[PDB]
Each structure stands twice: as C-alpha cells, then as structure tokens.
Amino acid sequence: PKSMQCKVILLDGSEYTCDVEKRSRGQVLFDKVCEHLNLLEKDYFGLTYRDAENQKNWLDPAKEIKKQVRSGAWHFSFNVKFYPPDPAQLSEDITRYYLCLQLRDDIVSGRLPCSFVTLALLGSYTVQSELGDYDPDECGSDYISEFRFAPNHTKELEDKVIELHKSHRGMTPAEAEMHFLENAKKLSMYGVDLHHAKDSEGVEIMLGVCASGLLIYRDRLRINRFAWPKVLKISYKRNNFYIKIRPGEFEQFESTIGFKLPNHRAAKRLWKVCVEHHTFFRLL
Ligand SMILES: CN1CCN(C(=O)c2ccc(F)c(F)c2)CC1
C-alpha cells in the first residue's frame, strides 16, 4: 500500500508529520491529528490547505485528500472551523485551550480586530495561563513578552498586559483560558469568516459567515444580518452567489439576494462554508 507524507501546522506553530494511504479521505488524516492533540471535541475543528490560487480551503473529510490538494503539496493547517458561541459549554478544557490558540492567531493576524484594552486583557490571560502568577524578577520596567498579542506591538501595550497580569494572581490555566474566551467571544468579528464580494450594483462588500448567520458589510454605516433560520436556499452559479430568504409574515414571495465573487472557485467556497455553518449551527 503506497503512503503519502502529510505535514500539518499545529496551532502552537509546530509541525506534525504522519503518513496516510495515498487514496485516504480527509477524515483519516484529521483523526490522526486529533489523536496527536488528545482532542475529543473534534466537531469544531478541521484542516485547511492552500489551492493552486493560494486560497485557504477546508479539507473535506468525506473526500480523497489527493482529489482536493490535486497538484499541490500535502501540507495542511489545523484550525477552528466552527467557533463555539458559548465556549463555557464545551465539555473539555483542552478544547478551550485549542480555541484560545486559534483566537491568538486571529488577533495577531488582524482577522479579529480588538480595542487596545481588550488586546491587553486577552494578552494578560494568555500570560497567566502560560507563565502563571506575575513575577517582578522576570518583568522590569523595560519588559517585552516573547508572546505575540497584537498585529502591532507598542511598549504601552506591553505595560498594560503586565498591569492586568498582576491582577490575576492565583488564577489557574483553565480559569485564565475561560476568561480569555468569555472576553474574545464578545468581539464583533469573533468567528466571522470574511469573503470579498460585489453587490448586484458592483459595489465592493464583504460577506461574513458565522454561527448567527450571514453578514453583509457595505461600509462603516449599515450592516445587514440574515440569521440562518431565515435562509432556505444557498446557491452558486458561475461567479455568483445567491441566498433564498424566507418570506416575512404576510409577504407572498421568498426573496433571492445575489453577489459577484472574484471567480467560480470563490463562489463555490463561500457556498460550501455557508451550507456547513447552516447545518452545524441550526441545532442552537
Ligand atoms: C456532526 N454534527 C453533530 C451534531 N451537531 C452538534 O451537536 C453541535 C455541536 C456544537 C454546536 F455548537 C452546534 F451548533 C451543533 C453538529 C455537528
């Protein structure tokens, strides 16, 4: 039986390497990574790969790996796919731990915008979990953490992390991680997967996919929201993406809203992530 080497970037930035039979489905590799991570609450997570256009794609666990990566390398990242709206209800601390690691990357990358004070507060809970109690011996007036907290670091931010870290004396790692998540879950872009698109006029918008529904970001003024219950059909055709909205009370007709994506692969990718979010979260 011929086997293909897989490299998976883990959320702490280390590499997991394993082999699978070359006709293996995505679930096979995912199960190996999840066993490596001692992770049981696996339904929130997935593997990503980069396609020949360098776009992030979810590895479909039901389909052959080779039919997804095609000409590309068998190189993956382990990621949160469905962000829990209420991380306190997850069964295991280790699940909360991986969710924190993902969110730390979402913050540092700028995918998850965050006020100065919330960057410092989240940073302070990370430091508490990772180093434990504040120690002045390691932290002088000139201290800069090895920990990445933000898309740009300033000394003011480093100082505020330390001031808040001092307040967390006695806090255990699982407790600090739960505080991290209770704060992160409130951020307007928490667990929002953003897609560039054009409205049926030609105006550049962003489409956001998350637990609560589909978001349309036109600009700083006027954000549209379609809760998943209010969506009966999602479809794509060529470069276009459409959603079938349920009629409101006493309306005769459903209403269909349409968007232009960069290319056909982008429209298909947005359709699939919407269907998957809809299916996963219509049990809330
Ligand atoms: C494979 N299915 C199993 C059933 N299912 C859930 O139990 C579920 C878990 C957590 C959630 F937040 C949620 F919205 C739903 C979705 C995935």
**Ligand 1 pocket, 84 CB below 6 A?**
yes
Residues 6+ apart with CB under 8 A from 90: 41, 44, 84, 96, 99
Q: Tell me the CA–centroid distance for residue 59 and ligand 1, in Å.
A: 18
106 token code pair: 């979402």
Please name the residue whose Cα sits nearest to atom 14 of ligand 1: 281
Closest CA to 48 of 57, 37, 61: 57
Residues 6+ apart with CB under 8 A from 139: 162
Q: Tell me the CA–centroid distance for residue 254 and ligand 1, in Å.
A: 28
Q: Tell me the CA–centroid distance for residue 120 and ligand 1, in Å.
A: 32
Which method resolved this structure? X-ray
Element (H, E) at 18: strand 15-21
How far is Cα 252 from Cα 275, in angstroms, rounded to an integer?
Answer: 25
Collapsing DSSP to helix, strand or coil, 184 comes out as: helix
Closest CA to 176 of 110, 96, 108: 96
Element (H, E) at 29: helix 26-36
**Ligand 1 pocket, 62 CB below 6 A?**
no
How far is Cα 52 from Cα 73, in angstroms, rounded to an integer?
Answer: 10
Please tell me what resolution, in angstroms, this structure has. 1.7
Q: Tell me the CA–centroid distance for residue 43 and ligand 1, in Å.
A: 7
Neighbours of 221 (CB within 10 A): 5
**Ligand 1 pocket, 284 CB below 6 A?**
yes
Atom of ligand 1 nearest to the CA of 82: 12
Atom of ligand 1 nearest to the CA of 284: 14
Q: Tell me the CA–centroid distance for residue 255 and ligand 1, in Å.
A: 28
CB 270 within 8 A of CB 241: yes
How far is Cα 223 from Cα 24, in angstroms, rounded to an integer?
Answer: 42
CB 242 within 8 A of CB 199: no
Atom of ligand 1 nearest to the CA of 280: 16
Q: Tell me the CA–centroid distance for residue 38 and ligand 1, in Å.
A: 20
How far is Cα 177 from Cα 181, in angstroms, rounded to an integer?
Answer: 6
Element (H, E) at 123: helix 116-131
Residue 78 CA neighbour count, 13 Å, CB half: 28
Q: Residues of 131-155 as b/e, b for ≥16 C-beta within 10 angstroms?
A: eeebeeeebeeeeebeeebbeebee
Residues 6+ apart with CB under 8 A from 121: 164, 183
Closest CA to 89 of 178, 4, 220, 23: 178
143 token code pair: 């201290």
How far is Cα 106 from Cα 108, in angstroms, rounded to an integer?
Answer: 6
